[PDB]
């Protein structure tokens, strides 16, 4: 059936339907001359069925596809253009991205490529609803709410093309223009001025070098290939002295308490960069970014931990980059094979700035924190998550029951699950202790549940529960509602189910390992 | 509709249909006298709709519900009985466990309790297919292939009841009889003789005490409440000396290389037990098990790590328990409040034996290792899993495409994903580099894929990819098949997709962090 592949509710006809298309540097003005099937390259897809012109409803997603093909990581970004179809266009939304199914279910030729058929007058006749052409619609990606439009090459000949943004025209260093534009998406939101950050960093790099204690600490350096332990040892000493510079004061404050921001972590980072950068790499930005991009520990220098980007001012970010640069220049001689002063001060800074932008762009994007939807909560060796997104929703406004599955396991050795704290509201959200249980590798363990303070009922497994490598569990919470009255926000004390792991006397007080699965009340 | 709630393919009529029912100590012979609705207690469920007599097709799952209600953890287990319905019975399998839906969809009275209606002659008339009665069937649990039967209380009056096993009759210590019976499920398989283990342990405990170097090492002990660091310090020294006993030789060999089995871990374990066991607890087995069951680090003493139970002989298990006992007796004075010799040698051993059995029973059960089905692979700070079970199946025997989603994230700071190694078979399993990508918080990153040796193609993201707390990704692999010929096992080199994390020069060689998602070829 056609409804087995077509989502009618999301299909509609629009007049002057437009979208965006990321364009590579070199083609920003030529493409404005009109949309046409390239005579070189895949023409949209490896699969013949899916060849076509691609566009998205989101101009920021389009911007991410404008970077130079030979230098995808650190290359220039071209621009974004808006393409419009004069008259009426039918955006046909697909429930599936499988061409054989679509051709089968829509009763089309299984011999010809789906995208070719889509552009035929008979197809435009069947599903166009009187529109001049059909454009297929699919979810852009998971974790994304944008759509991807697949346009027939012949039909796309009608698109009017007009410039949105030409990044190259902005005249900014690196990919500053692209990321700045992308930052416009979030009006929180990290909108940094990288021109300023670029300038403060260099000022600080040059200043740091002209600093007695610093250039003196450098005097103590082996300046010869020494052991990594002594290399980290020297570097941590260096960092401790470098950080006393009055230009690195704020960072000195902001990095003093969070362990991830430690001097040891900066030293560890410096070392890793030094061990992977060789002459060739150092001289090539793209290759530098490639090398740097696969190293662990960049969060230390970025000031990112526990789900937050801590270094969010141009001043403090420049301080961290500059400090990192100084440290790499020192790490190189101790464990490297090239011109420390060269790479560190230039190709190293250019590249790391690039990686900061990649990461900020991610934290700027809408995402699910741990314990939300199917995102897992990783803690104390455990891994817990709602089995499905529906499981995370506690629906209200009816008399009846509901079940909610929570997947639980641990990374290695056998770790216990002491119980679970469940929310309750008399009548509106009661726990059915009879259908609530925890299955460990298929072993269904029942629960002995006790009410507690704050509209919370603690349930404990009637048999010991351990999870680990090879041993997994599924906590199934069964809620029952005698009242059809809806749950009101005021009645909901805590918005998460709390799975309790092993017991530790942290803070001199017996604290339990806490794993949280966040829910939403709906309907 | 009735097919919106009833799974016909799994519904059938059977003559002399039987199942099992776990029975509590005290009721093994009374219940054999006939099945009848208890006049005390919930009578099957908190929900009126689900009240009924419960049985399972699996006698080993039934055995797990025979333990004493007042002492669920360490209490005696009663037995298991087999109940039979003379004549014809209709086992009606349900696709849903929601009573309101079932009543709605089966067009029943929404006023009366579903389980009551199930036992009415008119209901038995409608869905019994000419059977004398209806018994509802539901999946026993997740990770389990057993079923749960829900019998109407009135109808269950016809059940013939006959003894399967009376654990109490076995005359074994603790819950030895129950776990031994349960071990019969796996004909691998850990079938230990706990009588022997109980005896060797005590022999070793007594012997260990009568050992010069040991009772001399004990002489060096503070025998007074000392600091935990010195307590662990003494204990590790103790362990090192205790382990030189000729009765602990095998264990000495088997625990020398795996870090989890270290002396430090035994010391850490000893300390934690000592800090939670008080007079009351010590004197009560149930309370001892409750306390012990929520402590971390039991895998060390159990010899369980990396998905395997290493201490799998009665001799070596007795050695570890005995060694643990000696160490707790020593840890107590240093960080405790009771009779060390008392608890350690008795209530401590009885309880830990119990926890060994719980854990062995889990590893004896069919389960999914990391990277299989939706079980996550937890490694190097990352967490990866197939989004759904269908995603883990690479179906073969047709020309077309398929998509497979892999969820990726990390526990804290930003960690990179370098690429992914994908399996390929020319024609039968080709990678469509056009539809294969990785979405980070909705940012769809394309891939630049290169063929490699061994029918493996390495794909690298065209933009740097980092994951962590608040940043998550979905790798979508798109496979394409030009040939309808099925993939043969010989053609399949490696059975897993390999996601590569950050790079580390472990073993002096630049090794990448490897995260594996195991697949299955089907159809």
| Residue whose entry in the numeric block shows the structure tokens 């990508």 | B437
| Residue whose entry in the numeric block shows the structure tokens 């059960």 | B365
Q: Tell me which H or E stretch contains A316.
A: helix A314-334
CA pair distance A11, B373, nearest whole angstrom: 34
Determine phi and psi for B112, rounding to 5 degrees: -85, 155
User: Taking the CA atoms of chain B, what radius of gyration do you get in angstroms?
Assistant: 29
Is A466 in contact with B298 (Cβ distance < 8 A)?
yes
**DSSP code of residue B43:** T
Is A469 in contact with B305 (Cβ distance < 8 A)?
yes
CA pair distance A279, A285, nearest whole angstrom: 12
Is A146 in contact with B442 (Cβ distance < 8 A)?
yes
Nearest CB neighbour to A362, from listed B403, B412, B440: B440
**B374 near B389, Cβ under 8 Å?**
yes
**DSSP code of residue B392:** G
Q: Is A491 a catalytic residue?
A: no
Which CATH number fits the domain B368-522, given the four candidates 3.30.300.130, 3.90.1300.10, 1.20.840.10, 2.60.40.700? 2.60.40.700
What Å distances lie between residue A280 and A265, A338, B459, CA to CA?
Answer: 27, 10, 23
CA pair distance A28, A163, nearest whole angstrom: 8
A150: three-class secondary structure by DSSP: strand
User: Measured in whole angstroms, how far is the alpha carbon of residue B170 from the centre of its chain?
Assistant: 27
Q: Is B21 annotated as a binding residue?
A: yes
A96: three-class secondary structure by DSSP: coil
A260: left (phi over 0), alpha (psi -120 to 50) or beta: alpha
Q: How many CB atoms lie within 10 A of CB A188?
A: 9
CA pair distance B502, A264, nearest whole angstrom: 19
Strand A147-151 relative to strand A473-481: parallel, antiparallel, unpaired? unpaired
What residues contact A163, with CB distance under 8 A and at least 6 apart? A28, A32, A79, A81, A82
CA pair distance B298, A523, nearest whole angstrom: 44
User: Taking the CA atoms of chain A, what radius of gyration do you get in angstroms?
Assistant: 29
- Nearest alpha-carbon partner for B204 in B348, B345, B360, B356: B345
> What is the token pair recorded at A266?
């900066």
Q: What angle do CA A24, A30, A33 make, to 5 degrees?
A: 130
- Nearest alpha-carbon partner for A299 in B502, B444, B479, B494: B502
Resolution in A: 2.3
B496: three-class secondary structure by DSSP: strand
CA pair distance A264, B99, nearest whole angstrom: 59
Nearest CB neighbour to B64, from listed A298, A414, A443: A443
| Residue whose entry in the numeric block shows the structure tokens 């629960």 | A447
| Residue whose entry in the numeric block shows the structure tokens 């009763």 | A107
> What is the token pair recorded at B212?
């010069």
The domain made up of B188-367 is a member of CATH 3.90.1210.10: no
Query: By CA distance, what is A435's nearest residue in B?
Result: B45
Beta bridge partners of B6: B94
Q: What angle do CA A192, A194, A199 make, to 5 degrees?
A: 130
Q: Write out A506-519 in H/E/C secondary structure.
A: HHHCCEEEEEEEEC
> What is the token pair recorded at B22?
């776990």
- Nearest alpha-carbon partner for B375 in A475, A414, A385: A385
CA pair distance A459, A447, nearest whole angstrom: 6
**A371 near A313, Cβ under 8 Å?**
no
Determine the distance in angstroms separating the CA of A213 from the nearest CA of chain B, rounded to an integer. 32
CA pair distance B103, B86, nearest whole angstrom: 28
Dihedral of the CA atoms A346, A352, A355, A357 (nearest 10)? -80
- Nearest alpha-carbon partner for B417 in B471, B371, B350, B339: B471
Boundaries of every domain in chain A: 1-187, 188-367, 368-522
Nearest CB neighbour to B376, from listed A376, A439, A441: A376
CA pair distance B289, B399, nearest whole angstrom: 58
Beta bridge partners of B77: B67
CA pair distance A222, A220, nearest whole angstrom: 7
Q: Is B504 on the interface with A (CB under 8 A)?
A: yes
Q: What angle do CA A262, A268, A272 make, to 5 degrees?
A: 150
Q: Which of A53, A65, A141 to mutate to test the interface with B (most CBs of B within 10 A)?
A: A141
Strand B18-23 relative to strand B79-84: parallel, antiparallel, unpaired? antiparallel
> What is the token pair recorded at A482?
């005698």
CA pair distance A91, A44, nearest whole angstrom: 18
**B438 near B417, Cβ under 8 Å?**
yes
CA pair distance B393, A398, nearest whole angstrom: 38
Solved by what technique?
X-ray
- Nearest alpha-carbon partner for A54 in B430, B441, B446, B407: B446
Strand A88-93 relative to strand A12-15: parallel, antiparallel, unpaired? antiparallel
Q: Is B382 annotated as a binding residue?
A: no
**A319 near A243, Cβ under 8 Å?**
no
CA pair distance A261, A24, nearest whole angstrom: 38
CATH fold group of domain B1-187: Diphtheria Toxin; domain 1 (3.90.175)
What Å distances lie between residue B327 and A234, B208, B225, B246, CA to CA?
Answer: 41, 11, 15, 17
Four-residue CA torsion sign, B116, B121, B125, B129: positive
Q: Mind telling me the catalytic residues of B? A: 148
What Å distances lie between residue A31 and A168, A212, B43, B116, B434, CA to CA?
Answer: 15, 56, 74, 72, 21
What residues contact B7, with CB distance under 8 A and at least 6 apart? B93, B94, B95
User: Measured in whole angstroms, how far is the alpha carbon of residue B490 from the centre of its chain?
Assistant: 33
| Residue whose entry in the numeric block shows the structure tokens 């529906």 | A390
* Class of residue B507 by CB neighbours under 10 A (exposed 0-12, middle 13-18, buried 19+): exposed
CA pair distance B469, B478, nearest whole angstrom: 27
**B279 near B332, Cβ under 8 Å?**
no
User: Measured in whole angstroms, how far is the alpha carbon of residue B3 from the centre of its chain?
Assistant: 33
Four-residue CA torsion sign, A159, A163, A165, A167: positive
**A71 near A285, Cβ under 8 Å?**
yes
**A301 near A266, Cβ under 8 Å?**
yes
**B421 near B495, Cβ under 8 Å?**
no
CA pair distance A241, A229, nearest whole angstrom: 19
Determine phi and psi for A176, rounding to 5 degrees: -55, -45
CA pair distance A405, A399, nearest whole angstrom: 20
Q: How many CB atoms lie within 10 A of CB A323?
A: 27
Q: What angle do CA B373, B375, B380 make, to 5 degrees?
A: 130
Checking chain A for breaks where C and the next N are over 2.5 Å apart, the residues before them are 187
CA pair distance B163, B79, nearest whole angstrom: 8
Strand B430-431 relative to strand B473-481: parallel, antiparallel, unpaired? antiparallel
Beta bridge partners of B517: B497
Range list of H helices, A184-313: 194-209, 212-217, 228-242, 249-254, 263-276, 279-283, 285-292, 298-302
């Amino acid at each position: 059936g056609a409804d087995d592949v077509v989502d009618s509710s999301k299909s509609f006809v629009m007049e002057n339907f437009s979208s965006y298309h990321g364009t590579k540097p070199g083609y920003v003005d030529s493409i404005q001359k009109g949309i046409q099937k390239p005579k070189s390259g895949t023409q949209g897809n490896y699969d013949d069925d899916w060849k076509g012109f691609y566009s998205t409803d989101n101009k920021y997603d389009a911007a991410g596809y404008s970077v130079d093909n030979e230098n995808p990581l650190s290359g220039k970004a071209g621009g974004v253009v808006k393409v419009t179809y004069p008259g009426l266009t039918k955006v046909l939304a697909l429930k599936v991205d499988n061409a054989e199914t679509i051709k089968k279910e829509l009763g089309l030729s299984l011999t010809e490529p789906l995208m070719e058929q889509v552009g035929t007058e008979e197809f435009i006749k069947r599903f166009g609803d009187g529109a001049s052409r059909v454009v297929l619609s699919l979810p852009f990606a998971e974790g994304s709410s944008s759509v991807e439009y697949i346009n027939n090459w012949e039909q796309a000949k009608a698109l009017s093309v007009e410039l949105e943004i030409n990044f190259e025209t902005r005249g900014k260093r690196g990919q500053d223009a692209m990321y700045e534009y992308m930052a416009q998406a979030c009006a929180s939101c990290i909108n940094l001025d990288w021109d300023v950050i670029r300038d403060k960093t260099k000022t600080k790099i040059e200043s740091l070098k002209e600093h007695g204690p610093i250039k003196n600490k450098m005097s103590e350096s082996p300046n010869k290939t020494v052991s990594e332990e002594k290399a980290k040892q020297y570097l941590e000493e260096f960092h401790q002295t470098a950080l006393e510079h009055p230009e690195l004061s704020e960072l000195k404050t902001v990095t003093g308490t969070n362990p991830v921001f430690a001097g040891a972590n900066y030293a560890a980072w410096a070392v890793n960069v030094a061990q992977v950068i060789d002459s060739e790499t150092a001289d090539n930005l793209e290759k530098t970014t490639a090398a740097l991009s696969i190293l662990p520990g960049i969060g230390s220098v970025m000031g990112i931990a526990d789900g937050a980007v801590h270094h969010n001012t141009e001043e403090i970010v420049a301080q961290s980059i500059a400090l990192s640069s100084l440290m790499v220049a020192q790490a190189i001689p101790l464990v490297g094979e090239l011109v420390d002063i060269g790479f560190a001060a230039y190709n190293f800074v250019e590249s790391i700035i690039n990686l900061f932008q990649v990461v900020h762009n991610s934290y700027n994007r809408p995402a699910y924190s741990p314990g939300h939807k199917t995102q897992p909560f990783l803690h104390d060796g455990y891994a817990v998550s709602w089995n499905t997104v529906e499981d995370s929703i506690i629906r209200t406004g009816f008399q009846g029951e509901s079940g909610h599955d929570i997947k639980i396991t641990a990374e290695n050795t056998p770790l216990p699950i002491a119980g679970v704290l469940l929310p309750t509201i008399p009548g509106k959200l009661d726990v059915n202790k009879s259908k609530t249980h925890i299955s460990v590798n298929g072993r269904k363990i029942r629960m002995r549940c006790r009410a507690i303070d704050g509209d919370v009922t603690f349930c404990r497994p009637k048999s010991p529960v351990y999870v680990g490598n090879g041993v997994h569990a599924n906590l199934h919470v069964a809620f029952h509602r005698s009242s059809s009255e809806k749950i009101h926000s005021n009645e909901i004390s805590s918005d998460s189910i709390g799975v309790l792991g092993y017991q530790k006397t942290v803070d001199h007080t017996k604290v339990n390992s806490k794993l949280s699965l966040f829910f939403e009340i709906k309907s």
